Amino acid sequence: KVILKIKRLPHAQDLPLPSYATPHSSGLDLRAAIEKPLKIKPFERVLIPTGLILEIPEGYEGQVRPRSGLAWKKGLTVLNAPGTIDADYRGEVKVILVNLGNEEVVIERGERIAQLVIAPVQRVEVVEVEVSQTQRGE
Amino acid sequence: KVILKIKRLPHAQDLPLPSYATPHSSGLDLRAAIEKPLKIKPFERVLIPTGLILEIPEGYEGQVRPRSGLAWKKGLTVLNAPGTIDADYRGEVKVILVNLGNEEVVIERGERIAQLVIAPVQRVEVVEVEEVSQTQRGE
Amino acid sequence: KVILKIKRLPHAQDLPLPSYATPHSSGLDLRAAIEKPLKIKPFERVLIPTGLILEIPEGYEGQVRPRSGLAWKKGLTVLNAPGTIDADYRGEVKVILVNLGNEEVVIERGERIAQLVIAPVQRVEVVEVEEVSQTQRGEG
Ligand SMILES: O=c1ccn([C@H]2C[C@H](O)[C@@H](COP(=O)(O)O)O2)c(=O)[nH]1
Ligand SMILES: O=c1ccn([C@H]2C[C@H](O)[C@@H](COP(=O)(O)O)O2)c(=O)[nH]1
Ligand SMILES: O=c1ccn([C@H]2C[C@H](O)[C@@H](COP(=O)(O)O)O2)c(=O)[nH]1
Ligand SMILES: [Mg+2]
Ligand SMILES: [Mg+2]
Numbered sequence: 001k002v003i004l005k006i007k008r009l010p011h012a013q014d015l016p017l018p019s020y021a022t023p024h025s026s027g028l029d030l031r032a033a034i035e036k037p038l039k040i041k042p043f044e045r046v047l048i049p050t051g052l053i054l055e056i057p058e059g060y061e062g063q064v065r066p067r068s069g070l071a072w073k074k075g076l077t078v079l080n081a082p083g084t085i086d087a088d089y090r091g092e093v094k095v096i097l098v099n100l101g102n103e104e105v106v107i108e109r110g111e112r113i114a115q116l117v118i119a120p121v122q123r124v125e126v127v128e129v130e131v132s133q134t135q136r137g138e
Numbered sequence: 139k140v141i142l143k144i145k146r147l148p149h150a151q152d153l154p155l156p157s158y159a160t161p162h163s164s165g166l167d168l169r170a171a172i173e174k175p176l177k178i179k180p181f182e183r184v185l186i187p188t189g190l191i192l193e194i195p196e197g198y199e200g201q202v203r204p205r206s207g208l209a210w211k212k213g214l215t216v217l218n219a220p221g222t223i224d225a226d227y228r229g230e231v232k233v234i235l236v237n238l239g240n241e242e243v244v245i246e247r248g249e250r251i252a253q254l255v256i257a258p259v260q261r262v263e264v265v266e267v268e269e270v271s272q273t274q275r276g277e
Numbered sequence: 278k279v280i281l282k283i284k285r286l287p288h289a290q291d292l293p294l295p296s297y298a299t300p301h302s303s304g305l306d307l308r309a310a311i312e313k314p315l316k317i318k319p320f321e322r323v324l325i326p327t328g329l330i331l332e333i334p335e336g337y338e339g340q341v342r343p344r345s346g347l348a349w350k351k352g353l354t355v356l357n358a359p360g361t362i363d364a365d366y367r368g369e370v371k372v373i374l375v376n377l378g379n380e381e382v383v384i385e386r387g388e389r390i391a392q393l394v395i396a397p398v399q400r401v402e403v404v405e406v407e408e409v410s411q412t413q414r415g416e417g
Contacts, residue, residue, distance in 0.1 A: 004262040007270055017264055022414045024226035026199045026259045044379065045352055055270045060260060061303045061394075063220075071218035072185055072234050079377065080348035082220055082340075082359055084392065088301035090270050091277030096348055098377060100217065100236055102181060115222065117199075118262045121303050122337060122395045124281035126294055131284050131332040131367050136160040138368030142401040145409055155403055162365035164338045164398045193409045198399055201359075209357035210324055210373055220359055226412035238356065238375065240320065253361065255338075256401045275299045 004118060005055035009033070009092060012051025015110045027065060027117035030095060031110050038107040045079050045098040048113060056087040056118065063117040064095055070113065075101025078114050085116065142256060143193035147171070147230060150189020153248045165203060165253030168233060176245040178237040183217055186233045186251060194225045199259040202233055202252050213239025216252055223254070281395060282332040286310070286369065289328020292387045304342055304392030307372060315374075315384035322356050322375040325390060333364040338398040341372055341391050352378025355391050362393070 006018065011033040018028035032038065033051030040046050056062050064083030070076045079096040095114045099105050107113060144156065149171045156166035170176070171189035178184055194200050200223030208214040217236040233252045237243050245251060283295065288310045295305035309315070310328035317323065333339055341360025347353040356375040372391050376382055384390065 002260055002262045003265050005265050005267045005270060007267050017266060019264060020261075022224065022226055022412075024196065024224055024412065024414070026222050026224050028262075028264070043377070045349065045377065047349055053270055055267070058301065065220060065222055066218040068218050068221060068234070072183070075183055075217070075236075077217050079352070079354055080343040080345055080358070081218075082342055083345065084303050084342050084394065086275065086299070086301060086303050088273045088275050088299060089277075090273050090275075096345070098352075100181065100183070100238075100377075117222065118260050120258065120260055120397065122279055122397055123297070124279050124337075124395045126296060126305070127280060127282055128294060129282045129284050129332070131282060131330055134160075134162070134365040134367050136162070136363065136365040136367070140399055140401050141404050143406040143409060144403055145406055155405060157403065158400070160363065160365050162335065163363050164361050166403070191409055193406065203359060203361055204357040206357050206360065206373070210322070213322055213356070213375075215356050219357075224414065226414040227417055228409050228412055228415055229417035238320070238322070255361065256399045258397065258399060274301070 002057055002060060007053040009051040027115035029112040030114040030116055032107050032113050034109050037109060040099045040105045042099050042102050045096055048095045048097055050093045050095060052093045053090060054093060058087060059120055060118055061085060061087055061121045063119060065115050065117055067112060067114055074105045075099060076105055140195055145191040147189035165255040167250045168252040168254050169248045170245050170251045178243050180237055180240055183234055183236040186235060188231045190231045191228060192231060194223060196225055197258060198256050199223060199225060201255045201257060203255055205250060205252060212243045213237060214243055279334055284330040286328040295393060304394035306389045307391040307393050308387045309384055309390050311386045317376045317382035317384060319376045319379055322373055325372045325374060327370050327372060329370050330367060331370060335364055336397055337395055338362060338364055340394045340396060342394055343391055344389060351382045352376060353382055
């Protein structure tokens, strides 16, 4: 099985480890490692720190995906979804939440704001050609 | 060879089954299983039912992705894209469309509003460490 | 061995070929093969040509993913992210940008606007059933 090393920064010690809700969940939940609650006005973005520093193994990546509950109930989503967490990233993972609703939103301390999904990547060799004909065409 | 079991709810029994458009398309067509045409004002979001209950096989997941056509022509996109459909999900798959254009948009009966891509997802074993490896890109 | 084949058009012959910024980078750089800068009005979308024509291997696909820096510093993103590039696509790949910030953005010619990630896609056979297996998650 693939192992995922996670190191909890000072502002993520009291919060629980990212875990799977169900034995067939696709991703681990990400929490807002914030001090005081955060107020997100409509139509602007906010950089929320998670307090996690991960070692994603070779051949795999991390994807910061939105939470379906926060998206429908409050109009909140991850701006750059799917956030590409490269396997060689050693800094603090951060989530860019943006409010596409027309009404104020508040994110509390330790609230699940996104989900990190670990998936295999295919690194391709790039060659320039001068392509095959298909039925889909252009 | 992998199979996908789909149960069509009564409001999706008349609509056609999800099918790959081309012999090498990546996703299935997701249709709005609604009776009346839906109007989405600018900056509005709607939860549209598909009438579909999926049996995504173990080791694979479902991703609700936006349509390139509706995105450019009208500004419609999936709010939680890529919408994660877990393998053990037995509920009715729903789609959250948001109108990020400047005009009102109408979603008609059984209209292609998203695409569902089946892709392999990797279950990992979470392990907490006190130090990570120093690496090229750094922070 | 996996191989991605790219045919470049005249308006994208001077840009560097899409490559990985780091040996462990997930996605290739996608650049705007345009002429003049782009007047990105807030809350407006645009269709940018890259000048690339790809031949993705069967069972694989390409994904247009937003850049993190452009999303935080200027509020730009790919509207249809992730942009599904089908394996049988033989046309020019285009990127749909959109401004979600409160300032106008200027897009330079050849500037990195998104990343292209190659990932394996699984073809599946749609067999309609009258019952799905019971799980612990249940009907969510
Ligand atoms: O939502 C996100 C997306 C990317 N990241 C990380 C993952 C990568 O190491 C960098 C991307 O830096 P770049 O200059 O865009 O290649 O940011 C993040 O922390 N949160
Ligand atoms: O756009 C979406 C995203 C998720 N779902 C389904 C698939 C997931 O297993 C359930 C539960 O979502 P959750 O991430 O646990 O809030 O919702 C959906 O029907 N449509
Ligand atoms: O962001 C994107 C998404 C799709 N495309 C292209 C490549 C895909 O094979 C086609 C899909 O177009 P469609 O008419 O939705 O099937 O569009 C693109 O150039 N940029
Ligand atoms: Mg098109
Ligand atoms: Mg950065």
